[PDB]
């Protein structure tokens, strides 16, 4: 089982905040 997905799932998000 694999909990690594969501991971990048709010990792994007966060890069997002910083690139915005």
Request: charged letters at 40%; a neutral charge; proline letters at 0%.
């Given at each position: 089982?694999?909990?690594?997905?969501?991971?990048?799932?709010?990792?994007?998000l966060?890069?997002?905040?910083?690139?915005?």
């Amino acid at each position: 089982y694999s909990d690594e997905l969501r991971q990048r799932l709010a990792a994007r998000l966060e890069a997002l905040k910083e690139n915005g």
